[PDB]
Write a structure and sequence with these properties.
Chain B: This is 3C-like proteinase nsp5. 2 copies of one chain form a homodimer. Helix content of chain A is 6%, strand content 44%. Chain A is mainly beta. In chain A, the strands form 2 sheets. A 7-stranded antiparallel sheet of chain A has the order 5-4-1-2-3-7-6, with no helix packed on it. In chain A, strands 8, 9, 10, 11, 12 and 13 form a 6-stranded mixed sheet that branches. Chain A has 2 domains: 75 residues, Thrombin, subunit H (Beta Barrel), CATH 2.40.10; 77 residues, Trypsin-like serine proteases (Thrombin, subunit H). Chain A is globular and about 40 Å long.
């Protein structure tokens, strides 16, 4: 059984940089999202994420929570996740922790397409640190979580599909699960 | 494969009558719940629901939405569901409709205990109008639903576990799916 998704639904936003838009997680005054939102159609072969994040402005980021626009007042990169500081804290932030899970352990995924929640799925990571599921197609930035009492433990952020059809992502500190690199 | 449950989680309340507690659905200023909340463990064998309800008053019902108490100002029985009118309207009431589904159609169930959402899962009504699910004691009043754009179609309310370990419920108008009854004696 998947966990109820209401507490996570209230944290999902849309993050746009140029012609890349994907899902982000809005907790307190920070928006977390995959760092490869700063790449374009050519910056995926070999990117210099250090150069790129310096080369971008706060106004180069479009953060929308439904029809509310959020102004980025600063950006940094924690491993493989971009952390966007915004001018207002999420009033719907639940109690949360960031945890790292192991293959075999199940968690719920709230699949989102363009910031809008589509479905809730229970999955588990395979021993190769991948998740099998066509439900994650196009849903980069969707998260995985468990709930204990009143507290949401975020454990996963979807990043990209592999040529093999499987999916790969990080924990909420930007550390990938398994041997993968966003390139 | 389950629908996001946030719209329904904001409608789930805890309903208590005497020593019996189960779940209710709070839409506008009405709470819908299984009528067997007015039964004790002993009453469920062969209860006279009309007689039991006539001896109940509004203050015999305790309704709580999170930590806010909703005072009951009226009650009526519609088939197998009880409709409790409360003194405030749910500000999170979504756009909604009540629908009756058919076997083979899928829907999401939000399993709740004591008014608190516990999990969500997709299921389908089997051809004998039962459902195979993971409900424990206290799950009665959990609801099943589909989402159409922004409209929530409520189609199921859980009522009882059958001797075979499958589950029986009604629609939101209080009519059982199939020939089952909310009592233990003389079940279909």
């Amino acid at each position: 059984m998947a966990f109820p998704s209401g507490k996570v639904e209230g944290c999902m936003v849309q993050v746009t940089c140029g012609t890349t838009t994907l899902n982000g997680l809005w907790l307190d005054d920070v928006v977390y999202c995959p760092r490869h939102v700063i790449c374009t159609s050519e910056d995926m072969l070999n990117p210099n994420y250090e150069d790129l994040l310096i080369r971008k402005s706060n106004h180069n980021f479009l953060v929308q929570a439904g029809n509310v626009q959020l102004r980025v007042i600063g950006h940094s990169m924690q491993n493989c996740v971009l952390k966007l500081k915004v001018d207002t804290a999420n009033p719907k932030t639940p109690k949360y922790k960031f945890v790292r899970i192991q293959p075999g352990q199940t968690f719920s995924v709230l699949a989102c397409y363009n910031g809008s929640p589509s479905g809730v799925y229970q999955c588990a990571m395979r021993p190769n640190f991948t998740i099998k599921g066509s439900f994650l197609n196009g849903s980069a930035g969707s998260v995985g979580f468990n709930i204990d009492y009143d507290c949401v433990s975020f454990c996963y952020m979807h990043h990209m599909e592999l040529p093999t059809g499987v999916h790969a992502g990080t924990d909420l500190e930007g550390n990938f699960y398994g041997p993968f690199v966003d390139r």
